[PDB]
């Protein structure tokens, strides 16, 4: 038997696999801020792609720099090869970018750099997270939310509201999709228990029912659309690592028992979700708002959680002892991780788009304290012609986008938008999502990496 | 945005991938017959992954030969890393397999070779497998005694030994019943979306354990004395089982043959009641009282199935809104599972009358021993010495063979409960594409095996 040459991808070869992947023509950047109705199309910003180091994994501290945000729209694509996707419209006229996105060649590419993608997305979380006894004391140990302060106290409260709905439309829309994932194959009565909570989001298979199907009258009734993924270029870095890490507990079954104790974690917790989110989007909105996706868990035992604990997790550990306890714990801890990055992400993306005025005028002071050399900020000098549109991403330090010559529409949120004339600019702040479009024939403008604009102050 | 390098994978490194995956130790050969518990160990015989031109795609003559047999075993394995098995007797002790199978690089070395291996284990179909509109779909639908497998179980020289044979082969699909078709409700598509969840939650006897159907075929196993473990009866799995099987998970996986799967299942629910109603009386007549037949008789009844809602719900639905053009591919999903039938019935026969004539055969190994002393046949001869328990596990040949043993004793295995027990100047005729393997029962075997290719040249 010949010897067995372990799988490894890196330096330069994991880079030029990235790139072919991510190459494919349905990733390359779009030349509207949406996408119409087609789902297999997907910004991925392949021309960053051979310049980012994915072998140094980054900690907590660096997971909204860009590499990351890259990282977090190459593996949604990846894992969503498994999910089944149509346009509304239908695949008449579509049928090309279907087959390029559903291909053996876009699955094996996007499977091969699977492994780097999923160690530089979560290996933070090494550092950031055993009998039967203390687990049943763990898990006993189980007000305004950060996103209710961001959405409330906004400028533009309804604005904020929108841009933190189409966060879930990968997650709500494709509802159970990344749970399925645990119901395939051969195993114990755990399985029918787990099939049972999947049954409950599909509505039991009545499509008016389905969870998707309110979700989507959700968005509808507040002026947004429920193709997928219309929002991509609005998606936050931390929304599709949430998203990501279903997917990621899913697809790889060693880390089944992580996925029970993220499932008994989020039943619990469900109702209070779905409550918090009823009662804040009809602040906003009003009679508005359909809240039925969120109404259909309102009441107090409208969930799994109970049945989670005593028909999944209680049976597995007496099938498979207790090594497998730390595994269902540290579910339940990397779960509330991404839940506070995503609390935090969110909040600081809500106060960019609120300060855009302000940090229009703050150009000035920063360009003058550039001026008196308070800062040795490199420059680039771009020229680009009308429609070039910069699709959105994010810098690592701040940055000074200054305009020469032309007319710049700076999109820093999904509603959230500048005019930047000449002799005008805005200033960037780190890891916050935001792009760029071209709206006179030719555009001149700078951009100085000041690393933290306050210094030029 | 630099140029797009196609994905590509042939010659030399393909096979180097192939050998890569394959190489992993939970797929190393058996020191036993069965796997005893553990879910996580498939014999792909790796030791001859490196010997087979996986570039040249074989025909529909040719897909009983041993590399389309390796091929399938090589894929059965790929796609059930996404499927979840613990052992019965729970995951304590066999955590390294457990962590050896569902691991970053076992999912990714097999999915490198996955389009490989596909375009070598269903190119064939290309050629067996030949613009619609709506209702001439609905004309060709509309178009669609002893069986095969009755006719083998039922004319066999040992009906218990036969019909056993066939119920193992079930077991993948069986056992994990819906898995394949699971596949396809995950995303976010039309109304169709919720028609397919339906008949995926009947046949998990809607999240119900005890009424779940894999419960119920685990009570068929054992009522005849099988056990339902995965993948006890690995090395007894033929070809064209697991390329049955095989298929939908080939269907499931790759969404751009959604359609296919929309057709296969329409055809499968309007044959299911004929099969089960088949099934249900062969095991009855074979086993009489004692085997548990409640898989089956779970559908009976005429009608009961969902293949009207498949055509109206799901079929109908689909081709008004994603337009006439995914009527060929709903045609080719029936079309292609319905050679795959006709396979697995040619494959399955061929089988049994291998098990049931092994004393024949032993005793034809005289004829044909000598045969090849006449200067009669020029056949290739290999002198192989090899010392107590080397299993050989279960593979074929591309040709007749015939093993003479010089001395020592051999259990030849031909099928599950098919063993010939084979001393000094004994032997056996090895017929072409049958599955077969053997351990050494002395503590030294000298034989040798002659490739004479048709036995018959040799009588």
Redesign the interface.
């Known amino acids: 038997?010949?010897?067995?040459?372990?799988?490894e991808?890196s330096g330069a070869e994991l880079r030029?696999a990235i790139?072919?992947y991510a190459?494919?023509?349905i990733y390359?950047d779009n030349l509207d801020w949406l996408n119409h109705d087609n789902?297999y199309r997907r910004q991925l910003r392949?021309?960053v792609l051979?310049h980012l180091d994915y072998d140094k994994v980054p900690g907590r501290e660096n997971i909204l720099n860009y590499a990351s945000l890259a990282v977090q729209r190459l593996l949604t694509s990846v894992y969503?090869?498994?999910?089944?996707?149509?346009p509304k419209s239908?695949?008449?006229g579509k049928?090309e970018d279907?087959?390029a996105f559903?291909?053996?060649?876009n699955?094996?590419?996007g499977?091969?750099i699977?492994?780097a993608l999923?160690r530089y997305a979560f290996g933070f979380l090494d550092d950031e997270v055993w009998t039967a006894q203390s687990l049943d004391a763990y898990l006993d140990s189980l007000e305004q939310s950060p996103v209710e302060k961001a959405i409330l106290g906004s400028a533009d409260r309804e604005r904020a509201a929108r841009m933190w709905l189409v966060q879930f439309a990968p997650d709500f829309?494709?509802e159970a999709?990344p749970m399925?994932?645990?119901?395939?194959?051969?195993?114990?009565?755990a399985?029918?228990?787990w099939?049972?909570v999947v049954?409950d989001e599909?509505?039991?298979?009545?499509?008016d029912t389905?969870h998707?199907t309110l979700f989507e009258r959700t968005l509808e009734s507040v002026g947004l659309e429920s193709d997928?993924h219309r929002y991509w270029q609005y998606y936050l870095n931390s929304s599709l690592l949430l998203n990501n890490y279903f997917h990621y507990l899913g697809?790889?079954?060693?880390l089944?028992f992580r996925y029970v104790g993220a499932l008994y974690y989020t039943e619990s917790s469900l109702v209070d979700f779905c409550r918090r989110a009823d009662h804040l989007l009809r602040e906003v909105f009003g009679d508005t708002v359909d809240t039925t996706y969120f109404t259909e868990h309102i009441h107090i035992d409208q969930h799994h959680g109970r049945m989670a604990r005593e028909k999944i997790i209680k049976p597995l550990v007496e099938?498979?002892?207790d090594?497998?306890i730390p595994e269902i714990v540290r579910g339940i801890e990397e779960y509330r991780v991404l839940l506070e990055i995503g609390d935090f992400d969110f909040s600081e993306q809500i106060a960019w788009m609120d300060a855009q005025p302000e940090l229009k005028k703050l150009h000035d002071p920063v360009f003058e304290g550039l001026k008196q050399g308070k800062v040795d900020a490199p420059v680039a000098h771009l020229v680009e012609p009308r429609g070039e549109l910069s699709n959105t991403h994010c810098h690592d330090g701040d940055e000074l986008c200054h305009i020469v010559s032309g007319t710049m529409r700076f999109e820093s949120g999904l509603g959230s938008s500048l005019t930047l004339q000449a002799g005008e600019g805005v200033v960037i702040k780190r890891n916050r999502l935001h792009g760029a479009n071209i709206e006179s024939d030719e555009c001149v403008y700078e951009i100085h990496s000041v690393g933290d604009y306050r210094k030029c102050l």
């Not at 559903?102 to 060649?105: E, I, N, V």
């Not at 399925?180 to 009565?189: S, T």
């Not at 697809?251 to 060693?254: A, G, I, P, R, T």
């Open positions: 038997v010949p010897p067995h040459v372990p799988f991808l030029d790139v072919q190459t494919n023509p390359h789902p392949p021309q051979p969503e090869a498994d999910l089944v996707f149509f239908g695949l008449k049928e279907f087959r559903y291909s053996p060649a699955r094996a590419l499977e091969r699977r492994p999923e829309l494709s999709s399925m994932r645990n119901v395939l194959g051969y195993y114990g009565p399985q029918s228990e099939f049972k049954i599909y509505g039991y298979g009545v499509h389905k998707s997928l697809k790889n079954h060693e089944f099938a498979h002892g090594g497998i």
